[PDB]
C-alpha cells in the first residue's frame, strides 16, 4: 500500500520557466551594459552545466557551486568580462524573488500531507535545498527532504532513494516518486521498488514513457493514482 510520496525538484515543484527567467536575470546583473547579450551567456552556461551534470549522474556526489563557479571562470576568460566573486550571491537572491511554484503544487502537496509521508529527493547541496524550499513558501509541506549531498551520490543512484525510503519508515513498494527525469526519477527509483510517476508537462517525452510506471501532465492526478493503487 502507498504511504509515502516522493517529489522531484527542479521541472516537477519548481518551473523550468521560472529558472530561465531567474537565471536570465543573474546574467544580466552579471553583466551589467558589458557588450554580451545576457541571453547568449546563459546559452554557453546551461551547455556547460547540462554537460557536467551529465557526467556526473550515478557518480559520488560533489559541490554543485564549485562546478558553477568554475564554468563562470571560465566564461568570463572566453568572454573578457569581469568574474562575478558574488555569483552565488546574485544567485541566492534572484532565486527568492524569481522562483516559482507550478500552479498546482501547493494544492497537491497539502491534499497529501497527513495522509501519506510526503518527501522531496533532489540532486542538491542540502542547505541550498532548504533555503530554496524556504523561498518558495513550500518547506514545511515536506515530512522529509533527501539530498545527493546526504546520500553520497546523484540520482540515479540507489542510495538517494534508499535513504528517503529508510527515512520514512517505509519500504520501497510502499512509495511513489514523482519526476519529470524518465532515467534518473522513473528509473532510478523503479530500481528500489518503488512505483514511478513520470510528469511530462508538456508532452515532449512520449519516446520515454514506457520507462514509467505511469504518466502525467499535472501533479493533481498524482492523488488519484495513489488512490487508485490503495
Ligand atoms: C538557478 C539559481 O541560481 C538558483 C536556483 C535555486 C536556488 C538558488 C539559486
Ligand atoms: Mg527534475
Known amino acids: 500500500?502507498?504511504?509515502?510520496?516522493?517529489?522531484?525538484?527542479?521541472?516537477?515543484?519548481?518551473?523550468?520557466?521560472?529558472?530561465?527567467?531567474?537565471?536570465?536575470?543573474?546574467?544580466?546583473?552579471?553583466?551589467?551594459?558589458?557588450?554580451?547579450?545576457?541571453?547568449?551567456?546563459?546559452?554557453?552556461?546551461?551547455?556547460?552545466?547540462?554537460?557536467?551534470?551529465?557526467?556526473?549522474?550515478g557518480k559520488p556526489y560533489r559541490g554543485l557551486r564549485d562546478i558553477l563557479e568554475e564554468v563562470m571562470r571560465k566564461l568570463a576568460e572566453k568572454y573578457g568580462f569581469k568574474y562575478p566573486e558574488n555569483f552565488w550571491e546574485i544567485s541566492l537572491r534572484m532565486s527568492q524573488r524569481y522562483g516559482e511554484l507550478y500552479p498546482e503544487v501547493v494544492e497537491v502537496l497539502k491534499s497529501l500531507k497527513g495522509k501519506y509521508h510526503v518527501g522531496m529527493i533532489t540532486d542538491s547541496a542540502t542547505e541550498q535545498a532548504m533555503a530554496f524550499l524556504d523561498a518558495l513558501g513550500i518547506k514545511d509541506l515536506f515530512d522529509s527532504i533527501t539530498t545527493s549531498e546526504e546520500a553520497g551520490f546523484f540520482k540515479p543512484h540507489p542510495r538517494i532513494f534508499e535513504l528517503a525510503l529508510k527515512k520514512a519508515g517505509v519500504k520501497g513498494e510502499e512509495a511513489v516518486y514523482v519526476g519529470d527525469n524518465p532515467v534518473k526519477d522513473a528509473g532510478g527509483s523503479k530500481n528500489l521498488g518503488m512505483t514511478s510517476i513520470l510528469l511530462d508537462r508538456k508532452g515532449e517525452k512520449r519516446e520515454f514513457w514506457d520507462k514509467a510506471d505511469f504518466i502525467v501532465s499535472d501533479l493533481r492526478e498524482v492523488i488519484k493514482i495513489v488512490d487508485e493503487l490503495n
Do not use: C, Q, W
Open 1 to 57: 500500500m502507498i504511504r509515502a510520496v516522493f517529489f522531484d525538484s527542479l521541472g516537477t515543484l519548481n518551473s523550468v520557466e521560472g529558472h530561465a527567467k531567474m537565471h536570465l536575470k543573474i546574467m544580466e546583473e552579471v553583466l551589467g551594459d558589458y557588450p554580451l547579450n545576457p541571453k547568449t551567456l546563459l546559452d554557453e552556461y546551461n551547455k556547460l552545466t547540462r554537460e557536467a551534470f551529465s557526467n556526473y549522474a
